[PDB]
Amino acid sequence: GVFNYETETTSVIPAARLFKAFILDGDNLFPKVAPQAISSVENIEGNGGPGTIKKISFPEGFPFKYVKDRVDEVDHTNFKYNYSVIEGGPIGDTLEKISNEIKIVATPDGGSILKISNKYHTKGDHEVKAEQVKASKEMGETLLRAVESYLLAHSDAYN
Ligand SMILES: O=C1C[C@@H](c2ccc(O)cc2)Oc2cc(O)cc(O)c21
Ligand code: NA
Numbered sequence: 425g426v427f428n429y430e431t432e433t434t435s436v437i438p439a440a441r442l443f444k445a446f447i448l449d450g451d452n453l454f455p456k457v458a459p460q461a462i463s464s465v466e467n468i469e470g471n472g473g474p475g476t477i478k479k480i481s482f483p484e485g486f487p488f489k490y491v492k493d494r495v496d497e498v499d500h501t502n503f504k505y506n507y508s509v510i511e512g513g514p515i516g517d518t519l520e521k522i523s524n525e526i527k528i529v530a531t532p533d534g535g536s537i538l539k540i541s542n543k544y545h546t547k548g549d550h551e552v553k554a555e556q557v558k559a560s561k562e563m564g565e566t567l568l569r570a571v572e573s574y575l576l577a578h579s580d581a582y583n
Pocket of ligand 1: 433450560563
């Protein structure tokens with residue numbers, strides 16, 4: 425079955441620039457700006473659109489070794505990005521996939537709002553726990569804040 429979790433957070437970076445950096449260039453940026461959160465990102469197959477598979481490795485001492493993520497949809501107009509965790513980490517005999525949807529919306533102050541949905545698809549019925557959801561949220565926030573700091577400090581990056 426499916427467990428749905430939604431959250432929202434804000435950024436001081438305009439939506440299109442944040443989407444270009446945080447979403448479209450995370451493979452380069454995450455290991456650079458948050459090496460204590462993501463050790464590397466490997467492109468396994470695909471050229472960035474639907475179906476592209478990446479292997480995200482975590483640093484030593486993290487709960488999980490890696491996950492493989494698959495790009496589902498990339499909407500460059502509406503700043504929507506859908507991707508799924510399809511192997512590694514929590515995926516296995518209790519959890520088949522985690523489907524994620526991010527939407528970045530502009531705010532008139534020149535920042536943005538990120539709307540995030542995480543859908544856990546379980547095999548049989550193995551409750552998803554609050555700590556697993558919390559860990560995902562914390563990781564996404566850490567990565568967001570690291571990218572935001574980089575964008576603030578490198579004005580010529582990503583426009
Ligand atoms: O669940 C996620 C996904 C994460 C993320 C987005 C895009 C990407 O390419 C990789 C990770 O962003 C987030 C940012 C948050 O503040 C809280 C979150 O829960 C999340
Ligand atoms: Na999350």
